[PDB]
Amino acid sequence: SAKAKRRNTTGTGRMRHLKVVYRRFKNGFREGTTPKPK
Amino acid sequence: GAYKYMQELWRKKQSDVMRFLLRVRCWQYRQLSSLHRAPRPTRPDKARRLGYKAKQGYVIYRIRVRRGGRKRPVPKGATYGKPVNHGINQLKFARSLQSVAEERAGRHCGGLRVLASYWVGEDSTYKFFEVILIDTFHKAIRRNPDTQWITKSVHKHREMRGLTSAGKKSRGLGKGHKFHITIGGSRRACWKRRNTLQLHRYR
Amino acid sequence: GGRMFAPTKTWRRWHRRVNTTQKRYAVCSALAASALPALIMSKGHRIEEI
Amino acid sequence: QTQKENLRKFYKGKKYKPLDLRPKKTRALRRRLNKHEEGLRTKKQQRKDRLYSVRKFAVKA
Amino acid sequence: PSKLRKTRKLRGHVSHGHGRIGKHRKHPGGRGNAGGMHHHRINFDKYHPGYFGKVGMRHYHLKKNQSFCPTINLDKLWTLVSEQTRLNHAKNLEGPAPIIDAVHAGYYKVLGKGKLPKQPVIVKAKFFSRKAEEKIKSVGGACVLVA
Amino acid sequence: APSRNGMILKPHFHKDWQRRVTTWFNQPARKIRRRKARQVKARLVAPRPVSGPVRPVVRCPTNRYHTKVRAGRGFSLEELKAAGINKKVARTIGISVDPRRRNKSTEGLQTNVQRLKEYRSKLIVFPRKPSAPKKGDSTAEELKLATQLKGPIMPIRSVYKKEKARVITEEEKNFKAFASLRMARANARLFGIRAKKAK
Amino acid sequence: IRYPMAVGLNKGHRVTKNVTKPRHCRRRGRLTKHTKFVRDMIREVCGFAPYERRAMELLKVSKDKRALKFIKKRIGTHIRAKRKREELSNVLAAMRKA
RNA sequence: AGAAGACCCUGUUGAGCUUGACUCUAGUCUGCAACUGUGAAG
RNA sequence: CGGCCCCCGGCGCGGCGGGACCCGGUCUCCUCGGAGUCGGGUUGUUUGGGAAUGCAGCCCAAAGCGGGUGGUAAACUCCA
RNA sequence: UCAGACCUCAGAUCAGACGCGGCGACCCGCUGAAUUUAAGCAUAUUACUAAGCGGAGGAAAAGAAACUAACCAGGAUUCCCCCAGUAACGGCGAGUGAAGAGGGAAGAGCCCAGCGCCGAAUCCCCGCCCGCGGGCGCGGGACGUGUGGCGUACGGG
Ligand SMILES: [Mg+2]
Ligand SMILES: [Mg+2]
Ligand SMILES: [Mg+2]
Ligand SMILES: [Mg+2]
Ligand SMILES: [Mg+2]
Ligand SMILES: [Mg+2]
Ligand SMILES: [Mg+2]
Ligand SMILES: [Mg+2]
Ligand SMILES: [Mg+2]
Ligand SMILES: [Mg+2]
Ligand SMILES: [Mg+2]
Ligand SMILES: [Mg+2]
Ligand SMILES: [Mg+2]
Ligand SMILES: [Mg+2]
Ligand SMILES: [Mg+2]
Ligand SMILES: [Mg+2]
Ligand SMILES: [Mg+2]
Ligand SMILES: [Mg+2]
Ligand SMILES: [Mg+2]
Ligand SMILES: [Mg+2]
């Protein structure tokens, strides 16, 4: 049942954390640092 | 120089010394559960011969598997179809009983990776094996460059993919005319390449 | 909302191969045709004062 | 943000940090070998790299 | 080009070129080579004789590189050397004879279908036909066997 | 299904072949990808040739090809020993080593020994530390005329040498080539049946 | 008068054979002085297999043909059977002297 | 009017069921070696 | 083969800090290997593999100038 | 043993780690059909396919010969071209069907156990002290039922 699989697969919902990993991957998963202040 | 004698000693399995050691142990091993940890390899020379070392992180698990073939699990032995598939009793599983021992030893211990396995006893209904597992997150394993290869994420559950010594044998791998069926990695990789219609652009 | 008759397959033979001798033949003819004033004007180019 | 900064300063350079102070990169990344572990070579390989490393050379023709 | 297809002229014709009495069904005679002995025997025996049955010995592991023996006749024997090689030696027929290595040109056996130019020549090959050797010995040449 | 005179065809399309059909629409992009990868690999080993190590001259096995030669995997340990090159030092200077290959004849043995002695004559070995050269390191004047070699190192060519034309002797004219082949087949076929009669 | 032919007894392109020492992989399975000492110690401690004693009893009663057919049925091929029958005959010739 | 006759026949179209139909099969009976040791007697 | 600015990841050339660390060639002397596995029988399955291509169940069960392969079963023998 | 050691086997919300589920296009290990074709149909075919189950990674898998070959010899694996719809298989019917060689893409090779030499020469943990690594412990363990160095068939010492 391919139609039933694409109704509750990854992406059909909200992705509260996968949408962030996709953003963190573009920067190499940087943590512990901050942008340079003004 | 003791490991060489044990190698030749364990080859005389029909001798009065080994028959007694294989009779009392198979009794002792069948009075335990089908899966239990051993404090040390029953065959120290055989374990190291497969990659075992007396370090912190190496564990031994004895597995008891039911001998015999594979009965077709169909209701009332009725395989609805052509008479080719009417076989229920005389069916043999594709993998060996030693491969099933590592699959059960590795599934119960998800935090460990199966390294190797060896035969320790037989019976009319039981085959006893000892599976060598490793704790790939122990510092005695991650700091030794000779064993860091198993700590990689590509070796997750090798026994489930037939990468161990006993599970790789049932795949038909090898060089020569005997193994033309697995040319190109696996059997399904070879079959997929042998049945792919290559349509070039300027064909 | 159904399926079209004979859905277009991606493995259609898009590309045609021509012989190297014919590919060079066509160039020798297109160059020889670029040397005649009648064919260049009949093509439409404005060469009436070149 | 102020208390979280003081907690990281308190657990700075300690072997066991709280789970909210440890880096959260990826479950796969946190289970890799360290930079020191992946750079460790056995004493047998250290001799083969010292003696039989690929030289820099050129060929005339 | 679908502009030249027969379907473009059958637009408007009901049966589309397949008859009204016997329609174009799916497989009114089977699929593939079906019925080669039952209802297509007449077509098979008439146009494909010898199709059914076994003949000859079986060879399990046939490596065609063992029986690799390309042949060349005598009417094309001088094509393995330049034209000047034949012309320079045609002037001095009693002097040295040119050597034609057939194995180097990719021919292991020399046959004798054609005639040979009236001048001696040293032919080097692995195998020689009987008539191929006669026409070389008669013209003044000699046959050399190469392993 | 059959018709007037034709050919009995064998279309191997009785499976789900359309599920497994590999098209080559990425062939032009693959040609650029490999071309780009060779350019990146060339910059990695900048002085060293882009092709890699040196391949020996080997004879093709079967009768269909035992007349020509090609490029093998690596030089035999016997050829490295005859050329005075250590098995482990050879791989450092870009020499392919094949511990499996044998040498049943001296023709192929001396073929690569010459090829292996000629390659070391063209070597320009840079010092391990540029500020202090060593014995095996080339002189600074030779290190300047050192460019990256493009293509395979010492391409294997088989230049055919002409057999010198000679006057045909009477022994060559009297040699029966056809009789010598038919009798060779009989003597090789009846060799075993005659060896029993001698007992 | 005598050319190298591609067919016959002396077939093949004539080349000078390069004779060297055999590669080290060829000595595999060669009885060293320690392996013989270790295997003879295991023979003293372990003894013989049940099918070996059954065969040694057939050899001492001059039934070598039935002993060979018994060993071949137990050990497998005919080549392995003769090598085992000769070994079991040597130990019988050894215990007669001792 | 409502329904591509359920009656009949055709199809090298099925299904339900049945047997002394063809070919198999779960189960069951039986034999062999293995698990299987110790001793006496005929 | 445009400028400017803020970052990121490399490579090359130098020195600094901490870690490794003697290699070759001859002779002599000495040393050298993986077992309920190979293999045989049988069964089922698989394969173009056909007196058995692979795999597996059960029984049998190795040898060490051995063992495996040499596309037809087998014995003797030679060879690779 | 100042009388307890060892072996085997337990308990803990013990100290510190790990496993679980998702995705599953590609990939690995199993399992496994029938429509369909044979103008019926039973082996065959469909197909070592779909569906079913397990396990990963950015690739996987395979991979350094118990190989091919029978040559004037080749030399890990993977992929492309060719071999070839060929050898072979098959109610020898329908159908099925590779490999050696040859040409290319890419090329990188290595490590143990055993054997015997080296005063276990080896390793983890805690605490402290230095700049995730380092020293220090007359700290606690693992380990002789075998850790480390040398060394692996191309021989090695
Ligand atoms: Mg692997
Ligand atoms: Mg639509
Ligand atoms: Mg070591
Ligand atoms: Mg009309
Ligand atoms: Mg109509
Ligand atoms: Mg009609
Ligand atoms: Mg039609
Ligand atoms: Mg017609
Ligand atoms: Mg026609
Ligand atoms: Mg009707
Ligand atoms: Mg009819
Ligand atoms: Mg019904
Ligand atoms: Mg089949
Ligand atoms: Mg999962
Ligand atoms: Mg049908
Ligand atoms: Mg039909
Ligand atoms: Mg599926
Ligand atoms: Mg990649
Ligand atoms: Mg891999
Ligand atoms: Mg098939």
- What secondary structure, in 3-state letters, does chain B show? CCHHHHHHHCCCCCCHHHHHHHHHHHHHHHCCCCEEEECCCCCHHHHHCCCCCCCCCEEEEEEEEECCCCCCCCHHHCCCCCHHHCCCCCCCCCCCHHHHHHHHHHHHCCCCEEEEEEEEEECCCEEEEEEEEECCCCHHHHCCCCCCCCCCHHHCCHHHCCCCCCCCHHHCCCCCHHHHHHCCCCHHHHHHHHCCEEECCCC
Distance from CA of G1 to the nearest CA of F (A): 6
- How many whole angstroms separate alpha carbon B166 and alpha carbon B160? 11
F81: which nucleotide lies closest, measuring CA to C1'? I25
DSSP β-bridge partners for residue F179:
none
Nucleotide J113, nearest residue via CA and C1': B49
- How many whole angstroms separate alpha carbon D19 and alpha carbon A38? 31
Cβ of residue C12 closer than 8 Å to a chain B Cβ: no
Cβ of residue F156 closer than 8 Å to a chain D Cβ: no
Distance from CA of B199 to the nearest CA of C (A): 7
Cβ of residue C10 closer than 8 Å to a chain F Cβ: yes
F13 strand J contact, CB < 7 Å: yes
Cβ of residue B199 closer than 8 Å to a chain C Cβ: yes
In this structure, the strands spanning B197-199 and F21-23 are parallel
Tell me which residue of B109, B1, B127, B102 sits closest to B50, measured CA to CA.
B102
Q: Which two tokens stand for residue B114?
A: 């199966």
Q: Which residue of D has its CA nearest to B137?
A: D31
Residue E11's alpha-carbon distances to C8, E6, E15, E23, F113, in angstroms, are 21, 9, 10, 17, 77
The approach used to solve this structure was: cryo-EM
Most B-contacting residue of F15, F19, F20 (CB-CB within 10 A), to test interface: F20
CB F128 within 8 A of CB D55: yes
**Chain B residues in contact with D48 (beta carbon < 8 A):** none
Query: CA G80 – C1' I51 distance (Å)?
Result: 21
- How many whole angstroms separate alpha carbon G20 and alpha carbon B5? 36
> Is the CA virtual torsion E15, E17, E20, E23 positive or negative?
negative
Q: Which two tokens stand for residue B9?
A: 């000693």
CB B134 within 8 A of CB B89: no
Distance from CA of F160 to the nearest CA of C (A): 30
CB G5 within 8 A of CB E109: no
- Rg value, chain F, Cα: 28
Q: Which two tokens stand for residue F168?
A: 């045909």
- Angle of helix G64-75 versus helix G50-60 axis, rounded to 10: 160
Q: Which residue of E has its CA nearest to G8?
A: E147
- How many whole angstroms separate alpha carbon A13 and alpha carbon A11? 5
Resolution (A): 2.4
Nucleotide J68, nearest residue via CA and C1': B176
- How many whole angstroms separate alpha carbon B137 and alpha carbon D50? 30
**Chain B residues 1-30 within an 8 A CB cutoff of chain G:** 4-5, 8-9, 11-12, 14-18
Cβ of residue B201 closer than 8 Å to a chain C Cβ: yes
List subunits contacting chain E, requiring 3 or more Cβ pairs under 8 Å: F, G
**Chain F residues in contact with B192 (beta carbon < 8 A):** 20
CB B30 within 8 A of CB B64: yes
Query: CA B187 – C1' H34 distance (Å)?
Result: 35
For residue E52, with 0-12 CB atoms within 10 Å meaning exposed, 13-18 middle and 19 or more buried, which class applies?
exposed
* 3-class SS shares of chain F: helix, strand, coil, % to 5: 40, 10, 50
Q: Do D37 and B142 touch (CB under 8 A)?
A: yes
DSSP β-bridge partners for residue F22:
B198
**Chain D residues in contact with A29 (beta carbon < 8 A):** 25-26, 29
DSSP β-bridge partners for residue B126:
B66
Ligand 16 center to B16 CA (angstroms): 68
B53 Cβ contact list (under 8 Å, min separation 6): B147
B70 Cβ contact list (under 8 Å, min separation 6): B91, B92, B93
Query: CA B70 – C1' H22 distance (Å)?
Result: 30
Tokens 């003081």 -> residue:
D6
Tell me which residue of E68, B45, F156, B34 sits closest to G38, measured CA to CA.
B45
Q: Which two tokens stand for residue D4?
A: 């979280």
Ligand 9 center to E40 CA (angstroms): 15
Tell me which residue of D4, D3, D44 sits closest to D20, measured CA to CA.
D4
Tokens 């015999």 -> residue:
B68
DSSP state for residue F29 in the 8-state scheme: H
The answer to whether the annotation marks E24 as part of a ligand binding site is: yes
Q: Which residue of B has its CA nearest to G38?
A: B5
Closest ligand relative to E31 C-alpha:
16
DSSP β-bridge partners for residue F95:
F54
For E137, phi then psi, to 5°, come to -65, -35
Helix (H) or strand (E) holding F125: strand F123-125
DSSP β-bridge partners for residue E125:
E145
Tell me the H-state helices in chain F. 27-44, 77-82, 87-90, 106-121, 140-144, 170-173, 177-189, 191-197
- How many whole angstroms separate alpha carbon E98 and alpha carbon F165? 5
- How many whole angstroms separate alpha carbon F153 and alpha carbon E86? 38
Cβ of residue B149 closer than 8 Å to a chain D Cβ: no
CB E63 within 8 A of CB F133: no
- How many whole angstroms separate alpha carbon B181 and alpha carbon B171? 10
In this structure, the strands spanning B126-134 and B113-122 are antiparallel
Q: Which residue of B has its CA nearest to G48?
A: B15
